[PDB]
Design a protein around this motif. Structure first.
Motif, PDB file in Angstrom:
ATOM      1  N   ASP A   1      -5.700   2.289  -9.638  1.00  0.00           N
ATOM      2  CA  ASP A   1      -4.317   2.256  -8.064  1.00  0.00           C
ATOM      3  C   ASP A   1      -4.887   0.667  -7.845  1.00  0.00           C
TER       4      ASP A   1
ATOM      5  N   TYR B   1      -1.550   5.838   1.410  1.00  0.00           N
ATOM      6  CA  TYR B   1      -2.840   6.336  -0.172  1.00  0.00           C
ATOM      7  C   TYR B   1      -4.651   7.802   0.682  1.00  0.00           C
TER       8      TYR B   1
ATOM      9  N   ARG C   1       2.632   9.307  -3.105  1.00  0.00           N
ATOM     10  CA  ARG C   1       3.335   7.875  -2.924  1.00  0.00           C
ATOM     11  C   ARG C   1       4.124   8.243  -2.605  1.00  0.00           C
TER      12      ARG C   1
ATOM     13  N   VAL D   1       0.880  -1.103  -0.378  1.00  0.00           N
ATOM     14  CA  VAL D   1       0.122   0.076  -0.588  1.00  0.00           C
ATOM     15  C   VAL D   1       0.845   1.318  -0.038  1.00  0.00           C
TER      16      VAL D   1
ATOM     17  N   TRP E   1       1.794   1.359  -3.745  1.00  0.00           N
ATOM     18  CA  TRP E   1       0.645   1.302  -4.780  1.00  0.00           C
ATOM     19  C   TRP E   1       0.405   1.478  -6.518  1.00  0.00           C
TER      20      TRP E   1
ATOM     21  N   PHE F   1      -3.572  -2.002  -4.927  1.00  0.00           N
ATOM     22  CA  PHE F   1      -2.778  -2.160  -3.549  1.00  0.00           C
ATOM     23  C   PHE F   1      -2.846  -2.941  -2.351  1.00  0.00           C
TER      24      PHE F   1
END
Lengths: 194, 130, 130, 194, 130, 194
Positions: free
Chosen positions: A65, A90, A133, A17, A20, A67
């Motif tokens: 996205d 995130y 990120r 995560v 991601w 994760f």
């Protein structure tokens, strides 16, 4: 010209995560018939868009996205939410137009000995802006004196493992999440659908 | 890999009064989430704890090694080091590394509970002789 | 790593005629800014310089190891190597690394005539025996 | 609605000059008279603009470049300068528009044993273009025989450590430098004076 | 490194029943393009192949080490490992590493029948003794 | 203000094709006379532009991509092509506007024992978008059994070495490629030439 959504959702492995993974999606005709066929999405939450009429909508670009988090944290993949995932891994914007979709992956991401390969950022001095990120692994300063890159008391490594066993409670089990961000501009739409 | 594994390195034949820095490299996850301890096992005797480190990097040492050994963390390399000083022939043993996951809800977990170490390396041999 | 530190590796028990490569990994700066010298201390004898290298990568060796040892630089890994060939029992010693800084103007500090180094590693043991 | 220069100036870690860090500044009001309030500045020189008019100007973007160099090398962070830093590490254009800010940081970046962690590039095949950044580590070919990535005679690692000790002369002591480059393009302005 | 070079590590003085993981680090290219073989040379005896691995990661072992040794590939570190278990004094030897390039058309150069390798390391010494 | 074409063509080191290098060329005078004078080019093909008129056209920006491949693969550096290089390493768009230049570099990139330092990507789950760049080293799942970051049967490292020896067939000798990409935008041009 199909959209490789069977590449985002049916991917063998997903990213951690804190790192991601994101896919660029355009120049295709998007089909939500595949989403209807699926019958295992624990969460099916759509923001600011129609969860039904999306087969008629058209958009400029689409971002997926993907994760993995635990079930307790899927609550935080939502606009205006807080916690360890939303603040440090995130973050979703409040004006989020799109949907977040997650499902239980205990059959894939959990091992009897414990799968620790999925990581998450535990410490950060600031909070992430939406769709930011952070993959840095600098020694976090948690005490008075600086660290100079040395790990010790109050000078910790910022990342952490998850620990995904099958015998965990439903709240502490791996959950693959895919956030479809529908971007529309003042440029004619390249993703449409039948 | 899919499971957490540990490998020790740095063992060697050394002289009395010599130095050695062992390494414990980890795979399958970040070692920053694991309490790590070092163990030695002289042939013909039961394995005995040497040193250990918390996930918040607090160190503990057996009395036989306190003042000579230094455990430290290097999660950039996914590694815990053990710096041994003033080695004597009694320090001859296979030095094993061991790990144990500390959840983020139990971060103040003391390091000394030996009965919680779940993952083990194969040990690196340290031999102190003239 | 605010302070410069050296760590040696590669020590082992080897046979006469064998070969070893020792590493000197540095930390806290570019080893390419430093003269690096290797030393060995055999039991009962004095500490003896064996090989060194300038910051412009000129090498020099003791007459006792000339043609048998090769010092080299790999600053990409912050490391200076020492290749040891045709090892005899007289080579049995603790091989330690040593470094000292060279300012860009005074780009001559480094030759083995400059045998006063400021930073030292703990040493790695090489035992040559049948 | 006020530009966060504190993230740049009051930062705990500074980059090496060869890998100089850059942060963008936008969507805020830049009060430079408040930035000049820190009486700790040994160098506050603006080029291409009048310092008093700074609170009355708008720009398309402003960039904050920060790094560490020696004391007597701050003179090279100016348009038209030559030297190891200006040629190989950080290069301002002739028609530069912005301010160069610097202050002695001997108390932070010096250790009694010597801090060698700040680096600089010593050799390069050509000089840097304005705002060009080179973080490569190609073996510099000082002689006529190729190196093929192997250090040796006339084949040198291009980077070099400084060596900051608190008992050095003021010209060999560490200085932290911030450059605020002001950019005017055919795009809407994002930074203005009060 | 314009030329391929192999460097072995992990050699140590161990005891009967102990274990060792030897590493073969490659420089100058991807070791994933190469079939890698492990050889050992005991004192007085000939050099003997013990294990090798294809580019499609099929493993083969000499009968003397089957069930005890495991060869595996870690191309992320440009390395092939040899995990040695249940060591005996007969395993005392210099363990050297060898490789040869495998073009993409001929993806069969590799099996221990292809025991003619072009690149070699200096070998790392493993001594098994009580 | 000459465009730095010599930095591109006369560079000591060239990139591996999977990690192909790219330098942006803007706001300068592109003197293509240097390419007209050289006779060493084994390949000089321009697309969507006349090769003899480069000194008479203006562009918004120019991009110069450079890497090393085999001789029998230079044909894959053309729009609409396929193969391991075009699909997995470096891909040109169908509407490519620029020139593909290549020359034999056996005297530079071949060594007696064999130079294995130039790499190419051999496996990829999908083809590259034009001008995409994949520098990942993730274990490639060749079969249906997951790899979990482990190399084994049908679990292959995706990169591969070339193996450049001076005695190789010309189709297996090293060739240095420079791809000039002329960007045509509805904007004032910044690269023109004499």
């Amino acid at each position: 010209n199909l959209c490789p959504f069977g590449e985002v959702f049916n991917a063998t492995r997903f990213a951690s995560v804190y790192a991601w993974n994101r896919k660029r999606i355009s120049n295709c005709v998007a089909d939500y018939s595949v989403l209807y066929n699926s019958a295992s999405f624990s969460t099916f939450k759509c923001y600011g868009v129609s969860p039904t009429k999306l087969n008629d909508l058209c958009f400029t670009n689409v971002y997926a996205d993907s994760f993995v988090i635990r079930g307790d944290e899927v609550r935080q993949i939502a606009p205006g939410q807080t916690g360890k995932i939303a603040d440090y891994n995130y973050k979703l914007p409040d004006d989020f137009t799109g949907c977040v979709i997650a499902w239980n992956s205990n059959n894939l991401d959990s091992k009897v000995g414990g799968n620790y390969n999925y990581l998450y950022r535990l410490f950060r001095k600031s909070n992430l802006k939406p769709f930011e990120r952070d993959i840095s692994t600098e020694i976090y300063q948690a005490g008075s004196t600086p660290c100079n890159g040395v790990e010790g008391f109050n000078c910790y490594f910022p990342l952490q493992s998850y620990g995904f066993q099958p015998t965990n409670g439903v709240g502490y089990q791996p959950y693959r999440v895919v956030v479809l961000s529908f971007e529309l501009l003042h440029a004619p739409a390249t993703v449409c659908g039948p | 890999g899919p499971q957490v594994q540990l490998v020790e390195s740095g063992g060697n034949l050394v002289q009395p009064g010599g130095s050695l820095r062992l390494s414990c490299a980890a795979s399958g996850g970040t070692l920053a989430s694991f309490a790590v301890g070092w163990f030695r096992q002289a042939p013909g005797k039961e394995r005995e704890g040497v040193s250990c480190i918390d996930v918040i990097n607090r160190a503990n040492y057996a009395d036989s090694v306190k003042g000579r050994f230094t455990i430290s963390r290097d999660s950039a390399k996914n590694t815990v080091y053990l710096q041994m000083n003033s080695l004597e022939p009694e320090d001859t043993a296979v030095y094993s590394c061991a790990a144990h996951f500390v959840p983020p809800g139990s971060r103040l977990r003391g390091c000394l509970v030996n009965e919680l170490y779940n993952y083990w390396g194969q040990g690196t041999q340290v031999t102190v002789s003239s």
